Design a protein around this ligand. Structure first.
Ligand code: NA
Ligand code: NA
Ligand code: NA
Length: 479
């Protein structure tokens, strides 16, 4: 039972060469070795076009298998190549979590005439026009799949809103007259049901059942071990709960479930987790924003607050920790990018501490060429070494100075030579006496990261004095 580490295996600006599944296939053994235990794959199904990152969600039953939207393959490759990749993951002891997008659809085959009212963007409760007829992109027939797997077809009456009127060619937020916004949902802009595209109305039983059945079809087709659920703050809470329960029923395998409730507000997250009866984890979005505040502010940031307000502080067993993703990366919709100087500190925080299930971002591991962002594979690999081989046993925390902080793990007898001491500063360097466990007395610990040449000998009471340089992190272990 090595500590688990997941990886998001894509970034926004990946090349559209259709070879990503094959890359994943060939990378599997190396990822296992490095300490990755689970992979979050991008949406595997056909979006608006071939170059869709995956959130188009045109046809959930088309995994790069049918000629629809101007391509057989998705951006990532063919269904056959995806299944080959998954086999390779499975035989290297890596779990596969499928990205799941149920909030909306885009790329409809045809428009339909629809009575709609304009609502106020910042208050979707409030109409700002009378009902009139728009043309909405709501008709989905899936020509090319020809009823493989599912003969279900989507129509306007499965939706409650769009943001584009094709009749008079205008952007507005539209509620379909005589439909309701979903509920319960996040209450920013009054009701935050509507995000983009054609918004799915979960009030209809045909819909509830379709996404449950699609859910189970997908899980069985790819042999998934779990899911990331995107946009779950815009999807009615009762349905996400019903959906998750349904999948666990249908599936023989255990299913890990992580939801993205994108809010810088752990209370909002905790409520969601109340409503879900603690049947999934969430991404730790406030922590994302802690790291980003730190990155942006520089050393004046008080490092005692680095974990404060975070999901992982409060519910480590329900937290998926991360530094950045495809939406936080530069120029993206939720941009909150951790600069290179702070990034090792953030990664050490989520990889070497006992709480949270950490996620490594492909873009950090392999680089983001589009933006001249370097691959940080070596830095991350050392932290993975720390996590997999050394971050065990009782933990001691030292958030006791505004620049310099750290923590230790005493190791466990199950894992020989395990134990570690992390120290970092976001300002001038320094040192700190920290306890690593009386049982490690007399050992000599060195920095996995290479940022510090100090040798740290553990005293007879089990204390060492650990050193960090300025704007840096070190992780000392018994090598
Ligand atoms: Na929605
Ligand atoms: Na970030
Ligand atoms: Na500071």
């Amino acid at each position: 039972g090595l500590n688990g580490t997941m990886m998001q295996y894509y970034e926004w600006h990946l090349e559209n060469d259709g070879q990503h599944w094959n890359r994943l296939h060939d990378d599997a053994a190396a990822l296992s070795d490095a300490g990755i235990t689970a992979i979050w794959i991008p949406p595997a199904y056909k979006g608006n076009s071939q170059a869709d990152v995956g959130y188009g969600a045109y046809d959930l039953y088309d995994l790069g298998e049918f000629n629809q939207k101007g391509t057989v393959r998705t951006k990532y490759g063919t269904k056959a190549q995806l299944e080959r990749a998954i086999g390779s993951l499975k035989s290297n002891d890596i779990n596969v979590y499928g990205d799941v997008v149920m909030n909306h659809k885009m790329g409809a085959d045809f428009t339909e005439a629809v009575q709609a009212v304009q609502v106020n963007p910042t208050n979707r409760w409030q109409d700002i026009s009378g009902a009139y007829t728009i043309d909405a992109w709501t008709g989905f027939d899936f020509s090319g799949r020809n009823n493989a797997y599912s003969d279900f077809k989507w129509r306007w009456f499965h939706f409650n809103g769009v943001d584009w009127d094709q009749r008079y060619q205008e952007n507005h937020i539209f509620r379909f007259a005589n439909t309701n916004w979903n509920w319960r949902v996040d209450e920013e802009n009054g009701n935050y049901d509507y995000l983009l595209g054609s918004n799915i109305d979960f009030s209809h039983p045909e819909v509830q059942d379709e996404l449950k059945d699609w859910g189970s079809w997908f899980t069985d087709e790819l042999d998934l071990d779990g899911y990331r659920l995107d946009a779950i703050k815009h999807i009615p809470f009762w349905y996400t709960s019903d959906w998750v329960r349904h999948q666990r029923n249908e599936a023989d395998q255990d299913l890990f479930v992580v939801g993205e409730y994108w809010k810088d507000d752990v209370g909002a997250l905790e409520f969601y987790l109340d409503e879900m009866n603690w049947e999934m984890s969430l991404f730790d979005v406030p922590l994302n924003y802690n790291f980003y505040r730190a990155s942006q502010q520089g050393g004046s940031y008080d490092m005692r607050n680095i974990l404060r307000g975070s999901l992982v502080e409060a519910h480590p067993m329900h937290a998926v920790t991360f530094v950045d993703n495809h939406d936080t990366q530069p120029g993206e919709s939720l941009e909150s990018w951790v600069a290179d100087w702070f990034k090792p500190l953030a990664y050490a925080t989520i990889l070497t501490r006992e709480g949270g299930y950490p996620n490594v971002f492909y873009g950090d591991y392999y680089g983001i060429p589009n933006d001249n962002i370097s691959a940080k594979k070596d830095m991350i690999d050392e932290l993975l070494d720390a996590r997999q081989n050394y971050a065990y046993g009782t933990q001691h925390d030292y958030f006791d100075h505004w620049d310099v902080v750290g923590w230790t793990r005493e190791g466990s007898s199950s894992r020989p030579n395990s134990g570690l001491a992390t120290i970092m500063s976001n300002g001038p360097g320094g040192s700190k006496w920290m306890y690593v466990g009386r049982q490690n007395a007399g050992q000599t610990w060195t920095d996995l990261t290479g940022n510090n040449g100090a040798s740290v000998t553990i005293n007879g009471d089990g204390w060492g004095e650990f050193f960090t340089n300025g704007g840096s992190v070190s992780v000392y272990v018994n090598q």
